[PDB]
Amino acid sequence: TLKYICAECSSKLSLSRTDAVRCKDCGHRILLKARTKRLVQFEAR
Amino acid sequence: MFEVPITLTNRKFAQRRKLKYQYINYISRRFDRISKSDEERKFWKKYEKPEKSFEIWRTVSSQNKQPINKQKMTYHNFKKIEKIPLRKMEIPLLHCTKENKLYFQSISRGLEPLKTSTSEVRNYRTRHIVTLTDLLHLNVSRHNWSLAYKIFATLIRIPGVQIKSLWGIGVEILDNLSNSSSGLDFLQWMCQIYSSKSRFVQNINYRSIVPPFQTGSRTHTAKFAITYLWSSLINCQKSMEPTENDLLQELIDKISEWVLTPPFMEDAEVWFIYASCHLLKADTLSRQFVNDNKNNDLIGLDRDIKINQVIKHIHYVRTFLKICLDKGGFAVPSRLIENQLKSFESRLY
Amino acid sequence: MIVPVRCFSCGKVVGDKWESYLNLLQEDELDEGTALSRLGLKRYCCRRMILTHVDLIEKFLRYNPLEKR
Amino acid sequence: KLIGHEAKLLFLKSFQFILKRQIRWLITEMRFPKEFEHVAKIIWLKILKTINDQPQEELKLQLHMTSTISILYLASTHLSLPVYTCDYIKWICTAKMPYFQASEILPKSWRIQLPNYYVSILEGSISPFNGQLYNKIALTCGMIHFKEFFNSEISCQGLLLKLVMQCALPPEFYFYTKQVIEFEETDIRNLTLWERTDERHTGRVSNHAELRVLSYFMLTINWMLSFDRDRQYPLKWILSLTESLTQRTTTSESIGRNIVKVVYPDKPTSSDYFQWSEEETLEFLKWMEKQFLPTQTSMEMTIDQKIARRKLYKIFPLDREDTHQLTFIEDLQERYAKQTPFFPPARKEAIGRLLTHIASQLLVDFAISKEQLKDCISRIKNACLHR
Amino acid sequence: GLLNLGVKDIGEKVIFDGKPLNSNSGYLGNKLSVSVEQVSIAKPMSNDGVSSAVERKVYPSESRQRLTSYRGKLLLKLKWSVNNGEENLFEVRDCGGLPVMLQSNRCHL
Amino acid sequence: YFDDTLNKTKIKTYHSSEPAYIEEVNLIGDESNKFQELQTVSIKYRIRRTPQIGDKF
Ligand SMILES: [Zn+2]
């Protein structure tokens, strides 16, 4: 499930290519792309 | 018995209105001649729309345009006008249902229908809603607070509510509901729900929302938005002068946002209610600097910065009361407010 | 940002001495000098590490967008 | 989105499904095992048989809001578990049926099947008037040829019981009316469900068995009490029954009958509407906050309007900004006790007064005909005097 | 505020329709003196989609995240004086989005 | 992204002297009339700066 957070409502959501880019709980038009459990390697320096 | 929340089963009523108007344009046309769907829009274009209020009440004193029209009605003269419009109503009367044939033949005789159209609809959803609308009106007519809002709260969850009685029983139910909510909130939610900053009147057959009690944001004031400001100043008065305060400022800046467009735009209580909130803000500051010269023995307290802040405001208010008069505002009995304001000045001395 | 792990100059682990030190200025109502003396930061490299710290993370943390407000 | 034959197929399908959902709540409610379930299946299997035959482009078969319950009614007749008026009132009162709203589906999609002008025209169009359910049942029987396939339908010594307990339940009028039924009521034989009124004019042959049962019921009461020479039923006794009757709460039943009254129809209960005995008012709003809770899940608002709506409900959220009331046989007991002091022109008037009341009650559960009922009454009146 | 004094200094702008009239044929094709009485500035609001909607206060965080201006609708009460007084016309005109100073008496903050 | 004219999945390449990490992806439909397809996105990169020879202090 892809996720997109409402910049103004904190409500988690899962946008689709078939829906309006808006917070369904707030109505905002700005969305932070949520971080997920994805592996990234790091040199501990 | 009470007024229902819904668009009126649009089925027979819409063709009864065709036959009514079509006859009225036919009979009237031949009155205009003796004097020498679209029909329904033309009937209103022949008598204009309804200003923002209710009944085109306007004085009763200016123009004595004499009407003695000579009664001018010889049973014989009425049946000369009528003998031809009725035969032209039969063309369309045949294509109409048997119920609408006699409904037309009743209203064309001048009989009125004791058959309330909202006393026959038999639609589940609608069915109930009539029971709830009447239930809540019989419960506020005995002040049953704990049961009236249960019925009110269910009435809006069913798909059939246009602000309507929701904004007019939704506020008192919250005044009678000593518990949760200040019609205010609900009132400010309504204001944002129906700003209708768009100037729409006339044109189409307003047959779904015809009460100057929802609509506006054009010119025709909204009355829940005027009630929001009036309830808000009365909500400011209680236990003031008897940083968490702000309310009398919140109300100064929530009209400031307006400053005419539709409300500023249109005059009155808008201006007047604003001045009244402003006049109350001048009294509180005379009290907070009143009793026995301000509080007491003098002020020494750096001259009177507080008197100058108040005289600025008294001079400002008098500007708002004056522009509300000048712009046609009949609302304000100026004589009393000016005497109160001067006798109050005499407290500030 | 956050109390450094070790004193840049010396090498002494310092990240353990923050909350107690703050507690010791609160709880023990001590003075910074005596508090660090009881904490063992007996070198100015280790003294300065904590003395100069500005745990600005508390100011950052109030901007957390992952909770409603 | 669709139309013609294939639209007709899923219109068909959807009809298929809701009836199925109807039947299983059926089982949960009264729990009457495989039996209730399978008989109902094949009943519609039989109904489907006919639809396929006159197919080609036959679109006469979209089922009436009523056809579904007629089906369940007929099948219940296959088994003979209950009654019609009772079933109908119970169903409306508890929304036991998914009958009134057709959004359930499982269609979200069947909904969109751009329910053409078939799928949309279903599950909840309106409430039955007069026969309504009495005429469709006959049509179903005709298509069904139900009587041949069906054993002992419309009978039920249970409707008589339901009726006596219904009110002035007299440990004697059950046998009285059973006896007049015995009498000329189809040569002392349990009334069977009428036939497959094939004809489309749906004449009022008056063969719907129950309709006649209620008629015998009414008749019995006034005859009986209209000739109790021995004076077994005291003058002051008759009005006491009608008295106590004077509507009272209901361990569920009377509350239900109020809910049915609220189809506001011929104004016999309309006024009950306004009167609505205090609490009756209250337990009413209770049943509204529970059973029109799903008045609708959905769409609209376009990622806002919805929010606004939520906020609004937010605001006047409310819903709370002897267990007290009693059961059915409790009320029943207490009014037969309320009459338990048992041991000219006025009584005739009282008798007429009482009969109008029952006319209200029995008529109100059913398609009434503030005349047909009467017509029905008239009919057997005539039937009777051939002694 | 200063801005109303500014509009008090701009005074009038007069134009004559070459009022024909057939002095009435060269002494005024009817004077029309247009001026501006007040000028109003509102705090940033945003209406969704069109305008038939209820507006919301617009916050600077929004302008930065959107990387856009932080505009307030500028309005001014227009005075349309005809024939030196033959006709008075008022108009609240919206003059586009004026960039508002943050933390000003016109910024929500 | 995908442009029907090219019937191709095309990409905007990253142009820098050093690698970074994607810090924020911000979806902007704002000030738009509809634009529901989310055609404007602001992406913030976090580029670490280690103390190094030649850096001014
Ligand atoms: Zn160190």
From Swiss-Prot, chain A:
Span of zinc fingers (C4-type): 6-26
A GO biological-process term: transcription elongation by RNA polymerase II
Protein modification: The N-terminus is blocked.
Compartments where located: Nucleus, Nucleolus; Peroxisome
Keyword Membrane: no
UniProt KW keywords: DNA-directed RNA polymerase, Metal-binding, Nucleus, Peroxisome, Ribosome biogenesis, Transcription, Zinc, Zinc-finger
Gene Ontology CC: one annotated term: RNA polymerase I complex
Any GO MF annotation of the entry: DNA-directed RNA polymerase activity
Binding-site positions, Zn(2+): C6, C9, C23, C26
Note: Present with 907 molecules/cell in log phase SD medium.
Family under the similarity heading: Belongs to the archaeal Rpo12/eukaryotic RPC10 RNA polymerase subunit family.
Subunit structure: Component of the RNA polymerase I (Pol I), RNA polymerase II (Pol II) and RNA polymerase III (Pol III) complexes. Component of the RNA polymerase I (Pol I) complex consisting of 14 subunits: RPA135, RPA190, RPC40, RPA14, RPB5, RPO26, RPA43, RPB8, RPA12, RPB10, RPC19, RPC10, RPA49 and RPA34. The complex is composed of a horseshoe-shaped core containing ten subunits (RPA135, RPA190, RPB5, RPO26, RPB8, RPB10, RPC10, RPA12, RPC19 and RPC40) where RPA135 and RPA190 form the DNA-binding cleft.
UniProt protein name: DNA-directed RNA polymerases I, II, and III subunit RPABC4
Residues of the full protein shown: 26 to 70 of 70
From Swiss-Prot, chain B:
Compartmental location: Nucleus, Nucleolus
Primary location group: nucleus
Secretion signal span: none
Domain of life: Eukaryota
Keywords, comma-separated and alphabetical: Nucleus, Transcription, Transcription regulation
Any single GO BP term: nucleolar large rRNA transcription by RNA polymerase I
Note: Present with 476 molecules/cell in log phase SD medium.
Quaternary structure annotation from Swiss-Prot or TrEMBL: Component of the core factor (CF) complex, which consists of RRN6, RRN7 and RRN11. The CF heterotrimer may further dimerize to form a hexamer. RRN11 interacts with RRN6, RRN7 and SPT15.
Name of this chain's protein: RNA polymerase I-specific transcription initiation factor RRN11
Gene (UniProt): RRN11
From Swiss-Prot, chain C:
Presence of keyword Transcription: yes
Chief site of localization: nucleus
A biological-process GO annotation: transcription elongation by RNA polymerase I
A Gene Ontology term for the protein's cellular component: RNA polymerase III complex
Compartments reported by the entry: Nucleus, Nucleolus
Highest taxon above the source species: Eukaryota
Other information: Present with 5300 molecules/cell in log phase SD medium.
Function (record text): DNA-dependent RNA polymerases catalyze the transcription of DNA into RNA using the four ribonucleoside triphosphates as substrates. Common component of RNA polymerases I, II and III which synthesize ribosomal RNA precursors, mRNA precursors and many functional non-coding RNAs, and a small RNAs, such as 5S rRNA and tRNAs, respectively. Pol II is the central component of the basal RNA polymerase II transcription machinery. Pols are composed of mobile elements that move relative to each other. In Pol II, RBP10 is part of the core element with the central large cleft.
Protein name: DNA-directed RNA polymerases I, II, and III subunit RPABC5
Swiss-Prot record, chain E:
Compartment(s) where it occurs, according to its Swiss-Prot or TrEMBL record: Nucleus, Nucleolus
Residue ranges of the TM segments: none
Family: Belongs to the RNA polymerase beta chain family.
Record function comment: DNA-dependent RNA polymerases catalyze the transcription of DNA into RNA using the four ribonucleoside triphosphates as substrates. Component of RNA polymerase I (Pol I) which synthesizes ribosomal RNA precursors. Besides, RNA polymerase I has intrinsic RNA cleavage activity. RPA190 and RPA135 both contribute to the polymerase catalytic activity and together form the Pol I active center. In addition, subunit RPA12 contributes a catalytic zinc ribbon that is required for RNA cleavage by Pol I.
Further remark: Three distinct zinc-containing RNA polymerases are found in eukaryotic nuclei: polymerase I for the ribosomal RNA precursor, polymerase II for the mRNA precursor, and polymerase III for 5S and tRNA genes.
Annotated protein name in UniProt: DNA-directed RNA polymerase I subunit RPA135
Organism field: Saccharomyces cerevisiae (strain ATCC 204508 / S288c) (Baker's yeast)
